[PDB]
């Protein structure tokens, strides 16, 4: 449980999705250069993601266009990794009985989440907190 609640979101990983952030109304984007951000452009070719489960509640978020894995570094910066490693795992949970939240597994004890600012920039791990809108995501069909 990693010392966290276990309310899981409904749905599956059968198909790819878009991870939509309410905060600024952005879709999670993994750039070929390893850069990660958010875009409002629904036609962007780098927003399609494939989630997969490691263990129950643990996921990988992979770019279908590039094959890169979403990850969060030692300093809390989100990046795109060519290969899957411990920094690529996230704890996917339901939040506010509706949204999906993604907590860095490696940094779970610190509550470091995946989050997008209103300007579409990713937030740094330590800057994320329960209660913010930046951490709330909606998985949409592609």
From Swiss-Prot:
Maturation and modification: In the nucleus, phosphorylated by PKC/PRKCD.
Phenotypic consequence of residue 104 to A: Decrease in LRRC59-binding
Effect of residue 124 to E: Reduced integrin-binding. Defective in integrin-, heparin- and FGFR1-binding, and defective in inducing FGF1 signaling, cell proliferation and cell migration
GO biological process annotation, one example: positive regulation of MAP kinase activity
One Pfam family matching this protein: FGF
Protein location: Secreted; Cytoplasm; Cytoplasm, Cell cortex; Cytoplasm, Cytosol
One Gene Ontology term of the molecular function aspect: growth factor activity
Residue interval(s) of motif Nuclear localization signal: 14-17
Keywords tagged on the record: Acetylation, Angiogenesis, Cytoplasm, Developmental protein, Differentiation, Growth factor, Heparin-binding, Mitogen, Nucleus, Phosphoprotein, Secreted
Chain positions recorded as heparin binding sites: 23
One annotated Gene Ontology cellular component of this protein: extracellular matrix
Outcome when changing residue 100 to A: No effect on integrin-binding. No effect on integrin- and heparin-binding, loss of FGFR1-binding, defective in inducing FGF1 signaling, cell proliferation and cell migration
Effect of residue 123 to E: Loss of CSNK2A-, CSNK2B- and LRRC59-binding. Reduced integrin-binding. Defective in integrin-, heparin- and FGFR1-binding, and defective in inducing FGF1 signaling, cell proliferation and cell migration
Tissue: Predominantly expressed in kidney and brain. Detected at much lower levels in heart and skeletal muscle.
SUPFAM superfamilies documented for this protein: Cytokine
Annotated spans, Heparin-binding: 117-133
Highest taxon, organism lineage: Eukaryota
Gene3D superfamilies in alphabetical order: 2.80.10.50
Primary subcellular site in the record, as a coarse category: secreted
Entry function: Plays an important role in the regulation of cell survival, cell division, angiogenesis, cell differentiation and cell migration. Functions as a potent mitogen in vitro. Acts as a ligand for FGFR1 and integrins. Binds to FGFR1 in the presence of heparin leading to FGFR1 dimerization and activation via sequential autophosphorylation on tyrosine residues which act as docking sites for interacting proteins, leading to the activation of several signaling cascades. Binds to integrin ITGAV:ITGB3.
Subunit structure: Monomer. Homodimer. Interacts with FGFR1, FGFR2, FGFR3 and FGFR4. Affinity between fibroblast growth factors (FGFs) and their receptors is increased by heparan sulfate glycosaminoglycans that function as coreceptors. Found in a complex with FGFBP1, FGF1 and FGF2. Interacts with FGFBP1. Part of a Cu(2+)-dependent multiprotein aggregate containing FGF1, S100A13 and SYT1. Interacts with SYT1. Interacts with S100A13. Interacts with LRRC59. Interacts with CSNKA, CSNKB and FIBP. While binding with LRRC59, CSNKA and FIBP seem mutually exclusive, CSNKB and FIBP may cooperatively interact with FGF1.
Family stated for the protein in its record: Belongs to the heparin-binding growth factors family.
The protein's name: Fibroblast growth factor 1
Lineage of the organism: Eukaryota, Metazoa, Chordata, Craniata, Vertebrata
